[PDB]
Amino acid sequence: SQTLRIGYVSSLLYGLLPEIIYLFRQQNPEIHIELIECGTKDQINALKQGKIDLGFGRLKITDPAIRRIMLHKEQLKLAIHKHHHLNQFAATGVHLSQIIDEPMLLYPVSQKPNFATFIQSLFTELGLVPSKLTEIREIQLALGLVAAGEGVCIVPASAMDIGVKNLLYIPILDDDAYSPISLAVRNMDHSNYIPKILACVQEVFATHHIRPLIES
Amino acid sequence: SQTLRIGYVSSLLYGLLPEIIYLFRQQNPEIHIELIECGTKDQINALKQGKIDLGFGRLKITDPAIRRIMLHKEQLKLAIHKHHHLNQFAATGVHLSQIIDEPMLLYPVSQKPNFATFIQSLFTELGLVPSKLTEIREIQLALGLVAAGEGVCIVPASAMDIGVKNLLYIPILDDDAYSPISLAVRNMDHSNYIPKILACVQEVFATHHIRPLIES
Ligand SMILES: [Cl-]
Ligand SMILES: [Cl-]
The missing domain is CATH 3.40.190.10 (Periplasmic binding protein-like II)
Known part of the structure; x- marks a missing residue:
């Protein structure tokens, strides 16, 4: 054994x-x-x-x-409430520069470095600064709060299977927007x-x- | 305001x-x-x-x-890997007495009493002692670990929608097996x-x- x-x-x-x-x-x-x-x-x-x-x-x-x-x-996606205005990009996808002013939920809250520091660097390397960042302790909470109307959240493709309801997942078009x-x-x-x-x-x-x- | x-x-x-x-x-x-x-x-x-x-x-x-x-x-279910032997009760259900010796996962790890304490209280009220308990910090983790073959996990009915693949949710048939x-x-x-x-x-x-x- x-x-x-x-x-x-x-x-x-x-x-x-x-x-x-x-x-x-x-x-x-x-x-x-x-x-x-x-x-x-x-x-x-x-x-x-x-x-x-x-x-x-x-x-x-x-x-x-x-x-x-x-x-x-793993391609990244922008989780949004299904009636949120960015649902116009459900077919075409969005670039990160288009969403910097959205109330955005970063996760998790854990020792660094982590997925939050990774997602933040994606904006920084692209020369972008999100104006309305809130830290949420886990992805499943972030996604639920998006569904409750608290904003948007960037997630890996596999997270689309997390069964929080009334969401749409917008493809992120950026080349570096993926998680290994x-x-x-x-x-x-x-x-x-x-x-x-x-x-x-x-x-x-x-x-x-x-x-x-x-x-x- | x-x-x-x-x-x-x-x-x-x-x-x-x-x-x-x-x-x-x-x-x-x-x-x-x-x-x-x-x-x-x-x-x-x-x-x-x-x-x-x-x-x-x-x-x-x-x-x-x-x-x-x-x-x-919310009626309680036993989440099992679809190939676990209790799948023979998929078409009907089980009583808590039938699973006291299954390696099982409790959740979450948070301020008690919580769901894990409730589940333990259901066994106690029936004079039953679960022989292998492991506390997992969130339902999301717990269900992913069931899928990985780590054991069984009692969950409320809403957990059937969480989206972790390769699971079965077995009805728990005891009168007290509900979560408000x-x-x-x-x-x-x-x-x-x-x-x-x-x-x-x-x-x-x-x-x-x-x-x-x-x-x-
Ligand atoms: Cl609680
Ligand atoms: Cl819970």
Whole structure:
């Protein structure tokens, strides 16, 4: 009985990751699985120090000791109330420069760096400043508050499946407006669970008709 | 001008509450609304102190100074991975006695008593002791972890719409297996917003073809 410690960020549990983990565990009943909530930012040191074996995150950091495998790039969307005036762009999409003056909900409230610092940098690199930012502690709260009439919110594509009601999701047209999904492992690690879990990634992605970046 | 402070349990944002609030907002544009996250327990003192005016709650907690209006009862379900062995009860349902030894997830991690304490109280009232309990910090996480194969999770009916794929929601058949949605106000409060918000509750419930249980 091998033990496999998998670090995850909460923002992947509403996407394909649970299904990927389930398939792996079904196919490898000998392996005891420990799922550990671990911020994208903390996974590098966790892996180095042997506290996790696999880090699933939104990692935009390469470390010399770490093999970072980019699985997917997730398009971002602007969640709006369905009768909000930006619903005119439901087909065509919007650029971030068009929405800077919207009451906008940033999430989460957690130790930095995080998805909020990422979303803020997207405006900063584009030379933009949102005038009406409010911090909300989690995406599911942000989305609910958008539905209640509190403004708009930028989310990854997979968040569209979070079942808050009466929303529309406007495609964000900007080239840099995407969030990566990453698998990180130690460079030294040649365990068979790595190719095995990558096979599960490819199979779950194919089930959902999403083309992955990697090629096994 | 008038400000209305509304306390809410975050999981209620997956249900009909945002549409209720949006409607109130549409019909009463002069009344500024503040939406404040506040657990059912904390709502009691927040109301006494005047920090909120309305408290939308997730379990039954009572206080002699606090008027509690039950809006709806949500039947409890056992969320399981679709391949879990209790799927043989998909077509009927289970009793709490049948699942006392399933690895199970409680939620949220917040000020108690909360939903997790309510669920534990249902077992206790039946003389039952769940043998493996793990507290998960939000329903969103908990359901993603069920999907990942971490166990089972008792949830209210509204949780069936959260959107985590590969789950089944098994009816829990015990008499006491329901979770109320209630509105709390100060007994001494006779403000204009109370009948107004209750009219919005009734309207939204009707718009969805679902029956309430208020004096009207
Ligand atoms: Cl809850
Ligand atoms: Cl609560």
